[PDB]
Amino acid sequence: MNIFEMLRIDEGLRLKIYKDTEGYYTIGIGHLLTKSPSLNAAKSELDKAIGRNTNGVITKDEAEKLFNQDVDAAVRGILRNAKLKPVYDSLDAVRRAALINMVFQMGETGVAGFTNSLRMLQQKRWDEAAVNLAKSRWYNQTPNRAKRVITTMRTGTWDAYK
């Protein structure tokens, strides 16, 4: 299992613009298009992102390209972040995948905001971090996916995904 396969499980794959859990216009593999209520602002963003007139639909390939850019951006964001970088450096390979997952879903700013949990992770206090991470809107809004991520963080194995 790797970060790509992990995220592909968590986000799914959709070739047509759709609304995410929060109601935002998304496409492909968890690629947020816009927080604007306009399906037209979404189509516009989509066309800009793809470099062609899509009329709200893309191919597998296109979705995969967005996905590759997104994980890359996710990783570079972590490494550029003064709050996140140290945590990441301190982690093993599995846990790193878990933080990348969170960052992809909630943005760098968002994760950087979980001050307490980041401190616990850095101290390798796994169980406690797991407990604190669950006290969040994130967890309450998307409980099954959050539990999977949190389990990966607590254990350092890919069990939740197998």
Ligand SMILES: [Cl-]
């Ligand atoms: Cl883009």
Ligand SMILES: [Cl-]
């Ligand atoms: Cl969920």
